């Protein structure tokens, strides 16, 4: 009754910890890509301001 | 032995609850950063089109 639910919980904890590491890596990757896109945006806005 | 595995199981159920809450937070922050990157790339395309008409 509780032995089976506790074995299932420890397997779910193993998967949750794997997902946590995966989410952290994906978050760091998206933050770098967002930073690169925003830098390109600043440079383009500066170009427009000089022409207009 | 019975009381030891009971505690260990209760501790794991609490750690899983914590991990799922952290994972939900990371997922929402990941979704936010991806949306912001996407929005910036779309503005970049529009700005490049504007520049090409002015130079």
Curated annotation (Swiss-Prot), chain A:
Function: Adapter protein that plays a key role in innate immune response against fungi by forming signaling complexes downstream of C-type lectin receptors. CARD9-mediated signals are essential for antifungal immunity against a subset of fungi from the phylum Ascomycota. Transduces signals in myeloid cells downstream of C-type lectin receptors CLEC7A (dectin-1), CLEC6A (dectin-2) and CLEC4E (Mincle), which detect pathogen-associated molecular pattern metabolites (PAMPs), such as fungal carbohydrates, and trigger CARD9 activation.
Tissue: Expression is restricted to several populations of phagocytes, such as macrophages, monocytes, and dendritic cells. Highly expressed in spleen. Also detected in liver, placenta, lung, peripheral blood leukocytes and in brain.
Signal peptide feature range: none
Quaternary structure annotation from Swiss-Prot or TrEMBL: Monomer. Homodimer; homodimerization is mediated by the CARD domain which forms an extensive interaction with the adjacent linker and coiled-coil regions; leads to an autoinhibited state. Homomultimer; polymerizes following activation, forming a nucleating helical template that seeds BCL10-filament formation via a CARD-CARD interaction. Interacts (via CARD domain) with BCL10 (via CARD domain); interaction takes place following CARD9 activation and polymerization, leading to the formation of a filamentous CBM complex assembly.
Localization annotation: Cytoplasm
Domain free text: The linker region, also named autoinhibitory interface, is required to prevent constitutive activation and maintain CARD9 in an autoinhibitory state. Disruption of this region triggers polymerization and activation, leading to formation of BCL10-nucleating filaments.
Protein name: Caspase recruitment domain-containing protein 9
Disease listed for this protein: Immunodeficiency 103, susceptibility to fungal infections: An autosomal recessive primary immunodeficiency disorder with altered immune responses and impaired clearance of fungal infections, selective against Candida. It is characterized by persistent and/or recurrent infections of the skin, nails and mucous membranes caused by organisms of the genus Candida, mainly Candida albicans.
Range within the parent protein: 163 to 214 of 536
Superkingdom of origin organism: Eukaryota
From Swiss-Prot, chain B:
Entry comment describing in which tissues the protein is expressed: Expression is restricted to several populations of phagocytes, such as macrophages, monocytes, and dendritic cells. Highly expressed in spleen. Also detected in liver, placenta, lung, peripheral blood leukocytes and in brain.
Localization annotation: Cytoplasm
Superkingdom, taxonomy of origin: Eukaryota
Written domain comment of the UniProt record: The linker region, also named autoinhibitory interface, is required to prevent constitutive activation and maintain CARD9 in an autoinhibitory state. Disruption of this region triggers polymerization and activation, leading to formation of BCL10-nucleating filaments.
Function text: Adapter protein that plays a key role in innate immune response against fungi by forming signaling complexes downstream of C-type lectin receptors. CARD9-mediated signals are essential for antifungal immunity against a subset of fungi from the phylum Ascomycota. Transduces signals in myeloid cells downstream of C-type lectin receptors CLEC7A (dectin-1), CLEC6A (dectin-2) and CLEC4E (Mincle), which detect pathogen-associated molecular pattern metabolites (PAMPs), such as fungal carbohydrates, and trigger CARD9 activation.
Subunit comment: Monomer. Homodimer; homodimerization is mediated by the CARD domain which forms an extensive interaction with the adjacent linker and coiled-coil regions; leads to an autoinhibited state. Homomultimer; polymerizes following activation, forming a nucleating helical template that seeds BCL10-filament formation via a CARD-CARD interaction. Interacts (via CARD domain) with BCL10 (via CARD domain); interaction takes place following CARD9 activation and polymerization, leading to the formation of a filamentous CBM complex assembly.
Disease: Immunodeficiency 103, susceptibility to fungal infections: An autosomal recessive primary immunodeficiency disorder with altered immune responses and impaired clearance of fungal infections, selective against Candida. It is characterized by persistent and/or recurrent infections of the skin, nails and mucous membranes caused by organisms of the genus Candida, mainly Candida albicans.
Protein name: Caspase recruitment domain-containing protein 9
Species lineage: Eukaryota, Metazoa, Chordata, Craniata, Vertebrata
